[PDB]
């Protein structure tokens, strides 16, 4: 920018999107990466491999195409994340993928976070991933219990119209249950 | 000491003051002479061109310039002309003043490296080439044979 000698960061570093130091450490395993990404409204999970001209995604799942299986709830929460992980994990298995390492990009490794929920899901789908059980949420919060109880302090529906008034961690089970057998795209 | 000892450009360029200390000051008094207030807005422009690459000690530079400018007072202390010596003595020169043991010399002076065909002096004058004479006297005190060249001046 200033002159011939000026050093311009790699594009993905300018865009503040890729942490290249972590990326290298990630690639060391030589295994596929379980890319755990979030959005204000959604949660994405991809299984990426290395390629000659860039990464190759062999399997993915987005919190939106969750409804395609009977999801009638918001998609930016814990139960959502888990399921998207499990969904991607299964598609992953179908693709012949057996193991992967968790890439949480620029997110923070906070215990019980959604990325770890995504990781839990993928593991349960059958994917072998280096992990640590007590950094994950306690199942109930994954089910979405923390939100149901939060609606107990109601007075006004936590959900604007949406589905239910007191919400459903049960809807969670019905879905997980569904994903664990048959059905299309899995 | 004789020019014979330093006029050739056979040694490496030695000018890094960060590694050389005790360098004698230059005897060259000024580089811009005459009406330096004015810019080259003159009709005629003569130059003294060196015809062989050589090294010119600050000694010869001063004597060459003095003899030329001191003469350009055929025009007056505040005459209408500007004189410029464009070269500076960057090359540091030594002398091994023990015999040939540990002979790297000690700094004794400085010189300017001029390549054949460069102009060492440039004067700016109105039709009144007294400067042509100031130079017959200047190239008299520098090692090389020289060419007195006139540029803007088809007023022959």
């Amino acid at each position: 920018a200033t002159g011939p000698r000026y050093k311009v960061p790699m594009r993905r570093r300018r865009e503040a999107r890729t942490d290249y130091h972590q990326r290298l450490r990630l690639l060391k395993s030589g295994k596929p990466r379980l890319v755990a990404r979030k959005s204000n409204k959604h949660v994405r999970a991809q299984l990426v491999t290395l390629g000659p001209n860039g990464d190759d995604t062999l399997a993915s799942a987005h919190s939106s195409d969750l409804a395609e299986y009977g999801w009638e709830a918001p998609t930016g929460n814990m139960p959502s994340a888990y399921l998207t992980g499990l969904l991607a994990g299964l598609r992953a298995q179908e693709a012949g993928v057996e193991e992967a390492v968790l890439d949480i990009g620029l997110n923070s490794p906070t215990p019980g976070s959604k990325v770890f929920a995504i990781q839990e899901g993928a593991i349960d789908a059958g994917l072998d991933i280096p992990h640590n059980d007590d950094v994950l949420a306690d199942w109930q919060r994954t089910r979405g219990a923390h939100i149901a109880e939060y609606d107990e302090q109601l007075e006004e529906p936590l959900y604007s119209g949406d589905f239910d008034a007191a919400d459903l961690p049960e809807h969670f089970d019905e879905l997980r249950e569904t994903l664990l057998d048959g059905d299309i795209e899995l | 000491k004789p020019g014979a000892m330093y006029r050739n450009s056979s040694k490496p360029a030695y000018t890094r003051r960060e590694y050389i200390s005790g360098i004698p000051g230059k005897k060259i008094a000024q580089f811009d002479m005459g009406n330096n207030g004015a810019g080259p807005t003159y009709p005629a422009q003569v130059e003294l061109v060196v015809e062989k690459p050589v090294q010119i000690r600050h000694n010869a530079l001063e004597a060459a310039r003095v003899a030329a400018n001191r003469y350009v007072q055929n025009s007056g202390a505040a005459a209408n002309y500007k004189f410029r010596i464009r070269k500076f003595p960057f090359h540091v020169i030594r002398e091994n003043k023990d015999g040939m043991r540990a002979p790297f010399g000690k700094p004794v002076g400085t010189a300017a490296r001029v390549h054949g065909a460069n102009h060492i002096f440039i004067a700016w004058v109105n039709p009144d080439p007294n400067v042509e004479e100031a130079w017959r006297r200047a190239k008299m005190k520098v090692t090389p044979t020289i060419n007195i060249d006139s540029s803007p001046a088809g007023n022959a």
């Binding site: 011939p4 000698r5 050093k7 960061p9 130091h21 290298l24 690639l27 060391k28 | -």
Partner: protein, 95 residues
């Protein structure tokens, strides 16, 4: 030379041009080679590890197995056969 350390006279070869300055891309540090492949040796000024003795910068050897993540490249120094332990970060496929 006034000294005989490995980095003697390496100012040029182990320095980056100002624009290639800074952490290098991971893609080439993870490249995988096969035994028999020809690879050009060139230290990457930005990558501290996996290096080889500067004297071999420019050699083109043959990958013949690996040690840990580092590769074992066979080269010929003058007329002598030598084996060099080097990481991908400092290797490139010939052709």
């Amino acid at each position: 030379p006034s000294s005989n350390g490995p980095l003697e006279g390496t100012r040029g070869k182990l320095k980056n041009k100002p624009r290639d300055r800074g952490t290098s891309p991971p893609q080439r540090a993870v490249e995988e080679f096969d035994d028999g492949e020809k690879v050009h040796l060139k230290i990457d000024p930005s990558v501290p590890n996996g290096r080889f003795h500067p004297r071999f910068d420019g050699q083109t050897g043959t990958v013949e197995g690996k040690q840990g993540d580092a590769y074992k490249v066979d080269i010929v120094d003058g007329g002598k056969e030598k084996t060099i332990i080097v990481t991908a970060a400092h290797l490139r496929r010939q052709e």
